[PDB]
Enzyme design. Structure first.
Site, short mmCIF file in Angstrom:
data_model
loop_
_atom_site.label_atom_id
_atom_site.label_comp_id
_atom_site.label_asym_id
_atom_site.label_seq_id
_atom_site.Cartn_x
_atom_site.Cartn_y
_atom_site.Cartn_z
N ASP A 33 -3.29 0.65 6.49
CA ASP A 33 -4.34 0.10 5.31
C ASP A 33 -3.47 -1.34 4.82
OD1 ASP A 33 -6.36 1.47 4.72
OD2 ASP A 33 -5.45 2.97 3.31
N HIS B 274 -6.19 5.97 7.43
CA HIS B 274 -5.29 4.94 7.51
C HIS B 274 -4.34 5.23 6.77
CE1 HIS B 274 -8.46 1.64 9.24
NE2 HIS B 274 -9.13 2.83 9.31
N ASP C 175 0.84 -1.22 -0.06
CA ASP C 175 0.20 0.06 0.03
C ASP C 175 0.80 1.12 0.16
OD1 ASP C 175 -2.93 1.14 0.39
OD2 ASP C 175 -1.63 2.26 2.04
#
Lengths: 206, 202
Positions: A178, A173, A15
């Site tokens: 995340d 987040h 991410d």
DNA sequence: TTACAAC
DNA sequence: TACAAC
């Protein structure tokens, strides 16, 4: 084993936080990576986790709308950001290691709306002239699609909740969290498929 | 039924033939589209099939290796090629109708390594300056990932064979991809993975 | 020290 | 519109 489940693909959850939607022009600001491992019964779960704060590459574009969304100030004294080369080289090194230890032949990005994170990581990899990038150059395991199949939800927060996970939608987040939520979601989806007899492909007839 | 399955996402199977890997610089040459439908039981299946040959856009790049690969001659006057505008306009028009008819709220592209096909359709739409593009701008159903989960295979041909399909052209690829997507979704239901409550019902 | 696969 | 991969 892990190397058997996805024909030798070593799934790595990724991410990124950025300063825009253009991987070529917009700064990569943050990246987290979680490796997966499978136990003796064939259940998938999170393994090793890395995360870095990243310095915007030279001449990079910084969208104000994006910085408002993630709350990152690329100039914060206490964020301790490393170069794109620094972060990716370390991530690549860990993943290669994981690949050899588990007997896989390459890595594949697990991500939510994966193309986004894949585009930024590949663009940063290319900028820092990193060689031996272990990731597939165009194939990914997108959880939005996988969640649509398994849970009838494409939005990360709702897909997690539908899966029975804790997800506070009101909270921002960062990459680290995340990534962890996405990794748990992916594991859950894969595991439930196995649980219900979808895998192995002979299980339903055993 | 259909629009309950993916929260109003109207799944449309797309496959493109191109003259390279770069969506912004390389010509789109061919596109096929297949809408899906459920019966009263809730089983997924192909509905309608659209197919167009596309005129390379003004000044587009044509990679010799890509033309060798797909065997398309962009200069053959007897290929019923149409403008990018014409093809997408009609595709978008059929998909909008499908959306309204089934009560969905938008379309999502189903494709194998979907980002490839998604980026080319978006680039063309942008070029043709198309308004009312019914497709989600960044979300897709990638059969490569779905097949990774369902069949442990990511390569299209291998995935299809592993699913018990015969696999030996956009039209052919799109149809195989559509059938593969349906088998994956239907098997999930068969095994009682969907609906969610199915596991705790008679 | 390819080719391969979304072309 | 905003939204969601930022």
């Amino acid at each position: 084993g892990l190397c058997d489940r996805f024909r030798g693909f070593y799934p790595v959850v990724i991410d990124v936080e950025t300063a825009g939607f253009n991987a070529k022009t917009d700064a990569l600001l943050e990246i987290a990576a979680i490796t997966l491992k499978m136990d003796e019964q064939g259940w998938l779960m999170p393994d090793t986790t890395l995360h870095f704060h990243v310095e915007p590459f030279v001449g990079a574009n910084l969208q104000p709308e994006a910085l408002a969304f993630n709350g990152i100030d690329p100039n914060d004294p206490d964020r301790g950001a490393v170069s794109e080369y620094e972060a990716l080289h370390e991530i690549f090194k860990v993943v290669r290691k994981g690949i050899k230890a588990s007997g896989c032949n390459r890595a594949i990005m697990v991500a939510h709306n994966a193309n986004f994170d894949h585009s930024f990581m590949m663009a940063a990899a290319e900028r820092a002239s990193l060689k031996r990038n272990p990731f597939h150059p165009f194939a990914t395991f997108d959880t939005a699609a996988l969640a649509g199949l398994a849970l009838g939800q494409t939005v990360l927060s709702k897909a997690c909740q539908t899966a029975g996970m804790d997800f506070d939608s009101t909270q921002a987040h960062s990459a680290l969290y995340d990534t962890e939520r996405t990794a748990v979601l992916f594991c859950e989806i894969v595991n439930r498929w196995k649980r219900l007899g979808g895998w192995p492909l002979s299980a339903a007839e055993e």
